[PDB]
Design an enzyme around this catalytic site. Structure first.
Site, PDB file in Angstrom:
ATOM      1  N   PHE A  10       1.895  10.975   1.327  1.00 14.44           N
ATOM      2  CA  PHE A  10       1.357  10.374   2.541  1.00 14.44           C
ATOM      3  C   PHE A  10       2.334   9.363   3.137  1.00 14.44           C
ATOM      4  CE2 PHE A  10      -2.476   7.871   4.391  1.00 14.44           C
ATOM      5  CZ  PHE A  10      -2.069   8.220   5.668  1.00 14.44           C
TER       6      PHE A  10
ATOM      7  N   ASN B 191      -2.291  -0.524  11.734  1.00 14.20           N
ATOM      8  CA  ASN B 191      -3.218  -1.353  12.494  1.00 14.20           C
ATOM      9  C   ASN B 191      -4.595  -1.279  11.852  1.00 14.20           C
ATOM     10  OD1 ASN B 191      -4.770   0.928  13.661  1.00 14.20           O
ATOM     11  ND2 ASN B 191      -2.970   1.267  14.967  1.00 14.20           N
TER      12      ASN B 191
ATOM     13  N   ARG C 253       0.852  -1.185   0.000  1.00  9.85           N
ATOM     14  CA  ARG C 253       0.000   0.000   0.000  1.00  9.85           C
ATOM     15  C   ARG C 253       0.886   1.232   0.000  1.00  9.85           C
ATOM     16  NH1 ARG C 253      -4.337   2.987   3.109  1.00  9.85           N
ATOM     17  NH2 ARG C 253      -3.061   2.645   4.994  1.00  9.85           N
TER      18      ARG C 253
ATOM     19  N   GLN D  93       3.508   1.548   2.941  1.00  9.98           N
ATOM     20  CA  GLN D  93       3.192   0.535   3.943  1.00  9.98           C
ATOM     21  C   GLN D  93       3.674  -0.844   3.493  1.00  9.98           C
ATOM     22  OE1 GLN D  93      -0.913   0.750   5.293  1.00  9.98           O
ATOM     23  NE2 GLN D  93      -0.894  -1.354   6.078  1.00  9.98           N
TER      24      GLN D  93
ATOM     25  N   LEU E 183      -2.887  11.088  12.334  1.00  7.88           N
ATOM     26  CA  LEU E 183      -2.637   9.731  12.805  1.00  7.88           C
ATOM     27  C   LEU E 183      -2.135   9.684  14.250  1.00  7.88           C
ATOM     28  CD1 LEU E 183      -0.782   8.376   9.566  1.00  7.88           C
ATOM     29  CD2 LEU E 183      -3.220   8.159  10.066  1.00  7.88           C
TER      30      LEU E 183
ATOM     31  N   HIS F   2      -1.739   5.612  15.848  1.00  8.41           N
ATOM     32  CA  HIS F   2      -0.723   4.708  15.354  1.00  8.41           C
ATOM     33  C   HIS F   2       0.540   4.985  16.147  1.00  8.41           C
ATOM     34  CE1 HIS F   2      -3.182   3.557  11.810  1.00  8.41           C
ATOM     35  NE2 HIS F   2      -3.619   4.798  11.922  1.00  8.41           N
TER      36      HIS F   2
ATOM     37  N   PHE G 166       4.421   1.514   8.602  1.00 11.43           N
ATOM     38  CA  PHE G 166       4.390   2.437   7.484  1.00 11.43           C
ATOM     39  C   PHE G 166       5.387   3.560   7.726  1.00 11.43           C
ATOM     40  CE2 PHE G 166       1.983   6.007   9.287  1.00 11.43           C
ATOM     41  CZ  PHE G 166       1.301   5.440  10.333  1.00 11.43           C
TER      42      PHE G 166
END
Lengths: 172, 172
Positions: free
Chosen positions: B68, B110, B63, B71, B130, B134, B121
């Site tokens: 951004f 998660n 991903r 991952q 976030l 996270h 990530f």
């Protein structure tokens, strides 16, 4: 008068280069299907309709079943839901002349009749039950040991236990 | 008296080696989360409960979202649905002391609260939204250019346009 084209995959397993697989494609029996595999090995068609390079370079064997086959060729989604032929999203089953009657045959994966794109599979056993249903279009002439190394990363569900990649490909 | 552990990923993109990313893990702030990442880089815990090696070797960034994060870390399913910590399938969010306040932070992916396994990530921008959700546990100290190369393979859905692999990893 035309010869059978030769192509190759460079394989790495779990990050390590393992060797090369060399194919011979039956352009005398399934010219349109062989030619799809040939172009996708070379990447010569440039950017496909999905905006991706029409090329097997950097693709994964996402479905691996021991005592059966290894499957790859999805270069738009890398998970088994994608792929694209040089003729468009899908093209018809050319013919079913050649039987899955020996190990190391190259054959078109599909999600039903006439849904050929870019996913292929390599048998490691005889699979006559796939006859009449998947189009065989070439064979492994070198590197069957590499095929058996990839196969050894498989499970019975088809989920791979290791990432096996086509790190380079082309026509010889 | 303990130092921050260093780990590294060797990266290849589309089949080509591109370089190395080097991390520094905040074992002084999140010792249990840092230690999970450390062991999974070394593979020192051997075979996990899922029967797979507890190791990032040969794993994919499945991903990738430009502007951004990228991952990876799923070594049981290679698609974002798997992974396993050294502590078991899941472990709790250790703490949220460190903020996603700069590029190149390592943070635990998660699927909700206290579901940490092995997916991580790397931010390439500030992502304060976030925070509190996270667990940030280390940072990139070398190879941010490689991070930006992987990022450049991403789409806004997160689907990758190219296969970026951790071909080797370990502790320095």
């Amino acid at each position: 008068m035309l010869k059978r084209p030769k192509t190759f995959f460079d394989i790495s397993i779990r990050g390590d280069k393992v060797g090369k697989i060399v194919f011979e494609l039956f352009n005398d029996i399934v010219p349109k299907t062989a030619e799809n595999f040939r172009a996708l090995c070379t990447g010569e068609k440039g950017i496909g309709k999905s905006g991706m390079p029409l090329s097997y370079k950097g693709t994964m064997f996402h479905r691996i079943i021991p005592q059966f086959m290894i499957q790859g060729g999805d270069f738009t989604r890398f998970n088994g839901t994608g792929g694209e032929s040089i003729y468009g999203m899908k093209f018809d089953d050319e013919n079913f002349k050649v039987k899955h009657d020996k190990p190391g045959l190259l054959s078109m994966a599909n999600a039903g009749p006439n849904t050929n794109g870019s996913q292929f599979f390599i048998t490691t056993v005889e699979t006559p039950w796939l006859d009449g249903h998947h189009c065989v279009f070439g064979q492994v002439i070198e590197g069957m040991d590499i095929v058996k190394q990839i196969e050894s990363c498989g499970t019975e569900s088809g989920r791979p236990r290791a990432m096996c990649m086509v790190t380079d490909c082309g026509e010889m």
